[PDB]
Symmetry: D2
Subunit: 106 residues, 4 copies
């Protein structure tokens, strides 16, 4: 999908996690976020259309998605241990990564 669609997927599923009651909802939202992050890894954001794909900027840009993917990976493991509250708390971790990339690149 395009960067904007992936971002709406990330935004909708982050809310599902913050509002969730059971593990299955959290697991499903985390899996959908991981798919959106991986698909978004390739995208060139507007602020960086001018820059070459192996510029310092596009490397740092892509590095943000590695942070997020890793955070989702750990969150799903916690979710798969019945630790709903601990997996929901991952949301707080994910939001930092969301804001850090936004601050630099949208």
């Amino acid at each position: 999908a395009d960067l904007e669609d992936n971002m709406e997927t990330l935004n909708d599923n982050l809310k599902v996690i913050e509002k969730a009651d059971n593990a299955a909802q959290v697991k499903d939202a985390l899996t959908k976020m991981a798919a959106a992050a991986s698909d978004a890894w390739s995208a060139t954001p507007p602020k960086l259309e001018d820059k070459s794909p192996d510029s310092p900027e596009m490397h740092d840009f892509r590095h943000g998605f590695w942070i997020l993917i890793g955070q989702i990976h750990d969150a799903l493991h916690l979710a798969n241990e019945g630790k709903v509250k601990d997996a929901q708390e991952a949301a707080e971790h994910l939001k930092i990564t969301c804001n850090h990339c936004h601050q630099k690149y949208r």
Copy 2:
């Protein structure tokens, strides 16, 4: 594009890394492998077309790409520090992940 194309990208660039002389070659090959792994994350492999997308198998399948992506992430950091030999020996780490997924699902 498809799982088989992503795999040939992973295979070709793994060899480039093993036969590389300088950092730029290693960096470029690692970046291409990361793109292939991320793009492959969503694929349903032939031996798992029968299985449900939330089966233990498709979860374990996807988990393999998280391991590889994480390994590529660290390898590129080492590559970006001029540690060519340390980044090349990441290749040895990557091959274990290649074989583990292949053993179960190829």
Copy 3:
């Protein structure tokens, strides 16, 4: 040495990172924090002296130090690439992990 000493090491060096100007200061503070986190991994915190060492609590407790160690690991890689501001903003990531463990066990 003890959990409280490790925590003051983490606290002092987190501030050094937030107020740093150059890479060497950030690198040095991150290295000291990594040493404190690793050394703290084995500690039994007061609020968990009652609990068995393989309880869900002491496992979750130890898991917190794995998150922090991983965050410090990535921060030092960024620091070693001359990306001072990117390494300093790791501080924001670290504080979430500090608070999550404190909320449950301090």
Copy 4:
């Protein structure tokens, strides 16, 4: 403990994992390996007594224990999902990290 004691702990528990029948044995061995790796993070190995503690060598040395700690972290998550075979296969991952550090530093 000293580096040699930590190494014997790593060696004994790696064998327990390769020989294990149930999750509890694997979980317990992984937890003991994590404790040994964290405690070993601080050690100065013989080949590097001459070198300063913030030399490139002692940084690369310590980086090896970050790889191992991360690998143990993932292995324990797999172990905590009843995936004994998948957690035992982590052993193959750990041995690469063992050999890579040995090759450079013992």
